[PDB]
Each structure stands twice: as C-alpha cells, then as structure tokens.
Amino acid sequence: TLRAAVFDLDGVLALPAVFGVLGRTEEALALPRGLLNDAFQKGGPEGATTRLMKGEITLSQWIPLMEENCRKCSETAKVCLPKNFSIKEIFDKAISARKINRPMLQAALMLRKKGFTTAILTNTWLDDRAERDGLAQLMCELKMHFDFLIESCQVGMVKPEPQIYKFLLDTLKASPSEVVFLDDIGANLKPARDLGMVTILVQDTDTALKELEKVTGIQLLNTPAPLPTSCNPSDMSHGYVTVKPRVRLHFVELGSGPAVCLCHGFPESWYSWRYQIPALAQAGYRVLAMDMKGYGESSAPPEIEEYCMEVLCKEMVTFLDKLGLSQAVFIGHDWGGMLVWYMALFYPERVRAVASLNTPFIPANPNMSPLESIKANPVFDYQLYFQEPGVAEAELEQNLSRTFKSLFRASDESVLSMHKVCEAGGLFVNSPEEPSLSRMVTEEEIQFYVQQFKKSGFRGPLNWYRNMERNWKWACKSLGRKILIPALMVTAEKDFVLVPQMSQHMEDWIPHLKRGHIEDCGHWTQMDKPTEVNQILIKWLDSDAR
Amino acid sequence: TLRAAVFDLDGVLALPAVFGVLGRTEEALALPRGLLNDAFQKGGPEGATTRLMKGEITLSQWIPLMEENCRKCSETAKVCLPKNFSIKEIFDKAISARKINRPMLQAALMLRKKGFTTAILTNTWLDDRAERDGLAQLMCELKMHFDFLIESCQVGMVKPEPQIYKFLLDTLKASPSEVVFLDDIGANLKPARDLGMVTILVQDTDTALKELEKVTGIQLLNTPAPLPTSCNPSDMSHGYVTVKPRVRLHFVELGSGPAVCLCHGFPESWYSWRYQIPALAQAGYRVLAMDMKGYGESSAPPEIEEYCMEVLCKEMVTFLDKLGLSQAVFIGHDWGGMLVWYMALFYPERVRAVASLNTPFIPANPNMSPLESIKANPVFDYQLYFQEPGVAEAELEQNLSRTFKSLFRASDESVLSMHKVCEAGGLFVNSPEEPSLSRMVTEEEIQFYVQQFKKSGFRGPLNWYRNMERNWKWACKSLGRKILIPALMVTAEKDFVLVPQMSQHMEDWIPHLKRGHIEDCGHWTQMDKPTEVNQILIKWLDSDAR
Numbered sequence A, B: 001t002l003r004a005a006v007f008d009l010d011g012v013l014a015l016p017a018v019f020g021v022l023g024r025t026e027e028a029l030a031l032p033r034g035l036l037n038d039a040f041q042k043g044g045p046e047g048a049t050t051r052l053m054k055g056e057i058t059l060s061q062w063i064p065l066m067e068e069n070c071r072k073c074s075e076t077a078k079v080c081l082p083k084n085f086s087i088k089e090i091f092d093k094a095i096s097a098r099k100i101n102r103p104m105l106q107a108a109l110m111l112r113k114k115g116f117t118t119a120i121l122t123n124t125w126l127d128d129r130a131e132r133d134g135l136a137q138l139m140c141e142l143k144m145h146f147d148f149l150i151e152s153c154q155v156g157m158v159k160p161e162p163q164i165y166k167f168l169l170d171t172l173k174a175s176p177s178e179v180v181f182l183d184d185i186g187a188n189l190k191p192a193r194d195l196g197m198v199t200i201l202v203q204d205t206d207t208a209l210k211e212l213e214k215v216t217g218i219q220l221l222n223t224p225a226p227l228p229t230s231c232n233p234s235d236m237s238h239g240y241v242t243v244k245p246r247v248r249l250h251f252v253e254l255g256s257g258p259a260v261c262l263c264h265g266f267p268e269s270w271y272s273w274r275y276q277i278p279a280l281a282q283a284g285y286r287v288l289a290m291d292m293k294g295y296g297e298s299s300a301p302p303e304i305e306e307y308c309m310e311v312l313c314k315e316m317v318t319f320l321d322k323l324g325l326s327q328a329v330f331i332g333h334d335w336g337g338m339l340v341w342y343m344a345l346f347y348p349e350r351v352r353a354v355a356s357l358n359t360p361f362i363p364a365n366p367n368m369s370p371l372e373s374i375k376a377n378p379v380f381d382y383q384l385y386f387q388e389p390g391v392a393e394a395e396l397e398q399n400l401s402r403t404f405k406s407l408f409r410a411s412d413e414s415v416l417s418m419h420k421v422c423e424a425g426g427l428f429v430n431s432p433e434e435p436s437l438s439r440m441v442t443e444e445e446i447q448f449y450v451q452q453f454k455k456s457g458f459r460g461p462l463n464w465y466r467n468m469e470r471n472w473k474w475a476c477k478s479l480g481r482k483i484l485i486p487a488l489m490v491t492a493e494k495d496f497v498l499v500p501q502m503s504q505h506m507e508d509w510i511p512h513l514k515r516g517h518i519e520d521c522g523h524w525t526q527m528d529k530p531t532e533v534n535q536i537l538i539k540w541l542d543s544d545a546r
C-alpha cells in the first residue's frame, strides 16, 4: 500500500531537461553525435561531474573542467569546437529555459492532499553563477509543495549509488513497498526498483501520470482546475509595528519586489487574502497582508473616533514610515477598499498604485447628510442596525462559528436577508442556528476567523461603520481633487450590497481608471473567485505598478 | 526661554529652493524678469497656487492652471513662450535637484538632543506626479528627525495666514516666546514675529545657524561629526518566523530594495546593528537585522547540537524560504561572520553577496583536531573556558550590567585580560565589580542588552562555541570549494582576538575578494566605528550587490 511519492527534478518536475540541451547544442552546432554528453560523463564516478553532483566542487569550478574534457572528447573524434563555443552560455540558457512541469506538480499536490508524503530527490550542484537566482526562485517555488527536498550536492551522495536510496527511505520513514519513485533516467530508476519500490520511467508527462494514477488509484489526469496555493498561518512571517502608544498593527509578509499592501474588509482578517499572498509574492511583489485596526493581532481600542477614515489613513502612513517604505501599492476590499481610495486622495505621494475590489469610489454629497444617503438605499439597512454601540456586538459575538458560517457564503448560498434588518431585530433572525458549510470555506478556515475574533470581538470592526458624519466632513475637503495615480476598480457581478452599477461614474473622478470584472462572484471576492482575482491583480500590477 | 524650533522646508531644510528655479528658467530661457514667478503668484489668496497649497487640488491638476496663467503673464508683457516650454519638466527637474540641507538638519538634531521640541512647518502640495516617489523619500528621511510635520495641504491652512501659526503653537503646546521659527520668506516670517516668536530669516545657512546658536546658547556650527542615526527599539517593525516546531527567529526590518540580512556575534543582539539599520535602509536596501538563534526574542533551545553551523545555516535557509526570499545579501560580525562564510560555501544560490566584519575565512585543517588549533593560539584561551556547560553561564549571568559594561569597550579601554582565562578562574576575575561606562555606549544601551539577556541567558549563545568538532567535520566537506560569489572582508586594526593578520590567506579561497580596513577599531566594530562601517558597506553594496 502506497503512502509516498518521490519525483526527480530534471525531466520530471522541471522541463525541458538540462542534459537534453547537450544534444540540442551539438545538433545545432553540427558537432559529432553524444560528443558533449560524453564530455559531461567523462570519468564516470571519479570524474568532474560526480564531484560537482556530490558537492565537492561548485558549478563555476566545474565549468572549466567540462571545457577541458570537451576538447579531449573532440581530440579522439578528430574534430574541433568553434571560437564562439561557451559551456557557461550553454548552461545559462538551458537552466533559464527550464520551467516547472505544472501537471506533474499538480499530481504531486493532489497526492499530498490525499495524505501522501512527497519528496524531490535530485542530482544537483552548488550554483555560484552570477545568474544563480533564476534556479534559486524555481527551487523555492517547487520545494514549498513537498515534505522533503533531497539534493545530491547537500547529502554528498548521488544517483545511482544505493546509499542515497537508503537515505531516502530513512528520510521518508517508510518501507520501499509504500513508495512510488518517478525518474526520466532508467539507470537512476534501477536501484529504487531493486529495493521493491514502484517505479515510473518518465518520458512524456501524460503516460507517466496515467501510470501514476493506475498505481495509486487516485485521479491525477484530467482533474478540475485546482485552487491557488493558500497560506498556513503558522508558516508565515508575522510583522508588528507600533503606530502610536496604544496602537500596534499586525501583518503577514511574503516575497520581494515592490511593496503591495493588502487591506481587508468587514468582518475580516489578513487571512481573507490567503489565496492572493503566495500568488502575488510569486509574481515578484513584496506582500504585506494587514490585520486592519480592530482585527486579529492588531490593536482594537474601544473609542469610536479611533476608526474614522482620517485616523485610519494617518496610521497607515505611520506604518509605511516605520517600515521605511516611501510607497506601497494599496489593494483594498470592502472597508479596506474605501480606505485605499482615501489613501490615494490624501496621500498620493505614498501610494504607488491603488486597486479596489467591489468598493466604488463615490465622492461625498455635501448637500446631503450621510445618514440620509444610507437610508436612500434598501441594501444599506444593516448599517443603521450597526449604529447603536453594543447591539450588533451582542448578536455577532453570541456564536462566532454561526456568524462566519452565515456571512461567508457564495452568491447561490445566502441564508441572510439584507432587507429590513432593523425591523427584523437582527442579521441572523431568519438564519439557522447551525448553518451549513459554504463551498468557499473549510471548517478549519471558519475556526481561524473564530479564534481571531475571540481576542477583541466586534466593537473595533463595527466602529468602522460608526464614523459616517466624521468621514463625510473629511471627504468634503477632497471634493475638488481627482485621482490621477494608477488605479484599478474590480467589480463583482453578484455582490448585492456593493453592486457593479455603483461604480459607473468613477471615470469622472479617476479619468485614467482601469477595470476588472468578475462574473458569478459574490461579496467575498477573494475566496469566491481566487483564480480570477489573482489573474486581474497580477496583470494590472505588471503593467501599471512597477 | 526657548524650548521649540520650527523650520521651513523649501530654502531652509532642503536646497536649492524650488521657487528659485522659476527665476533660473526665465534667465536661462531669456524671458522677461519674474514672468514665471508672477504666473505662479497669479490670483494671490484666490489663485490656483493657494488652492494647491491648501490641498483643494493636486499638483497634476495645478500644472495646466499654471500653464494657462503663464500665457496671461506673457500676453500683457507682449512676449511669447517657446514650443519646448513645459511646467511639468521645470518642476520635475527642480524637485529632483532639491536635496536636504545637511548642516540645517544637524542643527535641528542637536537642538532635539538638548531637549527641544522640533517641527517642520511647510507650504506644500499633494504630489500625484509619476515622479512623486523622489519627494516621498526626502520627506520620509526628513520627518523622522522631527517631533512634528505640519503640511499646508493637509491642514487646509497656508503661510502667511495667521491661523496656521496658532495651529503651530497649539501643536507645540508652547507659548510664542518659547519658539524659534526659521524661514527664507520674510512675508511668512512676519506673523510668527507678530505673536512674539524669535524669527530667523534664512538666506545663507551659516549666518542663519550663527543667529540660531546666539539665540539658543547651544553650539550648532563647527560642532564635531555626529554619530549616524540609531534605532529606538519600540519604533521598529518586529518580525517573527517559525523555522521548525520549537524554533522561532526574530528580526527588525527597515527599508525597501534588495534584502540585506545582518548577523550579529557573541554575546550580541539585532541592536548591535543600530547604526547600520537606518543607514543601509536610506542607501536603498531592505534591512533584516536578526536576533540569532539563542538571543533576544529568538528561540533559545538548551541542546548543544542545536547550535552547530549546519543547523544554524539550514534554519537561515528556512528563514528565507518562509519570507519568500530567493536570496539575501549576508553581512555578519564575529560568530555571525563565521555563519555568513558558511552560507556562501553551502548555499551560494541563496546568498546574493557575502560580507564579514572581523571574522576571517580560514578553511578547516583536516590534519588537526579543532581543540588542538584553539590551544595553539593564546588569545583563544577564553573559548576553552566556554566548553564546560554551566561555568561561563554562571559568571556571565551573575551580573548582566557588569558583563556588558566589561565586554563592550573601545581598544583604549580594556578591563579584560584575555590571557590565561581558565587558570585565572574566569573572564572578570581582574575586572571591577562596577565597571566604568565605555565611550561607545550609553547606560540606556547597556540596559537594552541586560533586558534582552534576562529572557534566555547565556546557554544558547555559549552553545555556538560548543560545536567545534561538529563544525570542523562539516567544514571538511567544503575543502575542495572556492567562494566565487561577491565577497567583502572588513578588518579591524585593534581587534586583538580577530586580528587582521588572520585574514591574509583568504584570496587563495576567495580570489575575487574585496576588502575594507578600519584603523583604531576594536572588536565591537559596528558601535566602535559606525560611520566607517556604513561607508564601507554602502560603497560595496552599491558596486557588488544590486
């Protein structure tokens, strides 16, 4: 009975294979056939390549030794290599061209999801080339999805030596019968099979995956599009900045490149960006996923005025100041989306670009009190219910698991009637005591929000809605301004509170505004349509925010 | 009696003045004299410039309005502006050219050090230009050194209106008699003087500073070279990464750009880099100042083996993995310097560049046990005293304040006889019970190390010295390798343990090695010679690690 899957890197998890380029280069340069491949193989277990693969020497020390035995191979073959000929150039290009074999990684992901222990077992080198970062990034993206990465150059052992195989079984804590091993080299497959391991010779991916699924009894080929990589809270770098004596801001941080500050809505968490964090980091950005004031590990002072837009925005400017960031791209959703437009209007020098999910930018009406405006829209009734301090806190804090289970639902799953929330007496009066689990969230994901909300409750979050008049007066100071920095408005088709229609006049105040639209998407945009969100944000970031 | 100093930005804390360019441009373009300056001034309190300065409109909305009144000014003057003429270009160049007036900032720093409340009061705009980041960075570097920054466009008030002055006194919580106000505009100086404020008209800096010192009674001109900006621990972004179930790593983080990982020595802290952190961040780098395993807010497991180089290096690789960093520049001192060379030998793909302060790279002698090698050097006797678990912990933990006061001393201040530490019975047997305070450290800085060491003590730190044999066996696997990535070796003239001479054969293993040398510098390199350290590291970073 299988419980572990092992994959080679070259020709298996990454394609095209690097050694296959030795053949390509000799065919392109009309050199004798295997000439370059024999030079690579020179000395076998005692040669330069084995010393390199065992970690005795680095790739840059190996380059001239490959060059010396490239001559020796051509000397006997009674030929001569050209004047342009460079091993460095050949390997630089080969390594750069080699990309992740996505269906192979997906199969490894599905196996790990079904309970398998997964590992990468590879014959590799210590890369000290000036271009080494390319491979560093690939190994980083790859390794994250596996329980173990075993590198020949780190363990001082090599395939096909039988010691690396015994090292593999020892690392896996499993007998050879419990293990599937995939390799593109028959010679490297042989010792694994010799111990009684299920072995797959990998030529084309599809056949290898058909063999993989037949042997494991798990569908790996033609399976539905998987969800983007999520975040395990305990595997993140957690950051904390004191913005004022009584206020500390918490954030999760991942990646390098331009700073991208993610701002969640009500009643959320940094975790609402779980599907965007690895994606944006992988796209070449430094992600800072906030716990907005009043939430999770961030401070939650009780005073209403502490949550007015002016104070919240000033604190986000201090947050940048204390981190030593002159700018950040600001991406917000719901209440975070509103803050993000206000950061753009009042602090354009600190905002590299601005993006909003669902939240439109609507200039304040100076000839109408905000309470009249909220009253004018039937869907905004819940906001009037949120005004009296203590009432909504009592209902929302009563049963946390029920609160998030009731709120976090797809467009085709609602249990919440937004109509006449005040007259009905509350948000969940028509909702079951034990709501069913939404298709968007696991029981584990609900419990993270439950645990987060046990710290400070709903007072701070609800206070974001309790500064309508203060926010309106502040917003009126910006009535003569336009948003002229790069901006993106993302609308969600089925958000019945933050309707796409509400964003239709935005080009009057943001003339160069770019857009994104998500069909069959409810209010909880990031978890509802994670793949589409990431596609829209990455495309916009690479074009307008770099 | 004065207790507050207020400075203008343009023509005072930053030079050359931006409006002075209106004159330069008309003189260069042979336009009528004041033509461009009158266009800027058009409408006075009701004009576009006042609307801009009060924050009613943004700089990009203002540009075409300045252009319209540039014509109106030339219409009456019976002239015509050329076809190349661009206000955007003129202001882009003017803002870019404007740099911090260093002696003015130094005077403000000295005043704040002597107990003054300091503030920047400026007539500025909301910058939404594509080039806005340049000014964002300048404001960021400037603001940090002041108690308050008052911007006309944020407060909706402007100089010379008397309301901004009353707002200033209210912000300062001081009467006009307690305040010095510096401005390059006589008209803007007038209302401050009208309230009874000491006023300085700023033309040339030196005269303004002579006036400043006469009026405050504090020497500001011709004063010694100040120390680089330090770190206040409570104003930093604190980061935490779990590298394995029982191990969490703490770090301080500042800036944007390539990641620079700072690794302290024994018995230190992230705080040992206090003078490098703001400097390196200001030079365009993302600084990550570690609490190395066993120190401060990082985990300190008791087991000796947890502190062998192999484990420590693997954990630093996991640290990069969890932060989403494919590489970092590694800069180490003392034990951190040793780790940093091992990161380069075993993980060259993860190290962008490597720099060491004091610690040389010496390949392991495979024909000599490490205990024989340590015995062969009289200065390394203290290391043999550190071998027996508990002994050095008892002496070092006995009185923490005495420990750091005894250790952290300049070359001309030693109280510690490194000769025969074992035979003498300990490190401090010849040391006073109440050592004098070194010129390198304040009493406050000693107490931070004292507070840090109260958490875990000296067991984990001393364990770094307790893996000689384990480290030697691991190092022998790298005996055939060379360090071929960018590298810097910084020697300290007066380090009597890590002597410059010990680094003389490094070019044999690191052929492209770059060097730095610090004269009259002891073991505590970073705090002993902070200015020189920063100069050497910044120059090397900008040339080899970018």
Ligand SMILES: C[C@H]1C[C@@H](CO)C[C@@H](CN)C1
Binding pocket: A265, A266, A267, A334, A382, A407, A497, A523
């Ligand atoms: C009570 C919730 C309902 C939610 C839409 O289901 C929107 C959210 C934030 N505006 C408030």
Ligand SMILES: C[C@H]1C[C@@H](CO)C[C@@H](CN)C1
Binding pocket: B265, B266, B267, B334, B382, B407, B497, B523
């Ligand atoms: C006991 C201290 C003395 C110090 C030099 O004063 C060096 C340090 C780390 N090698 C150990």
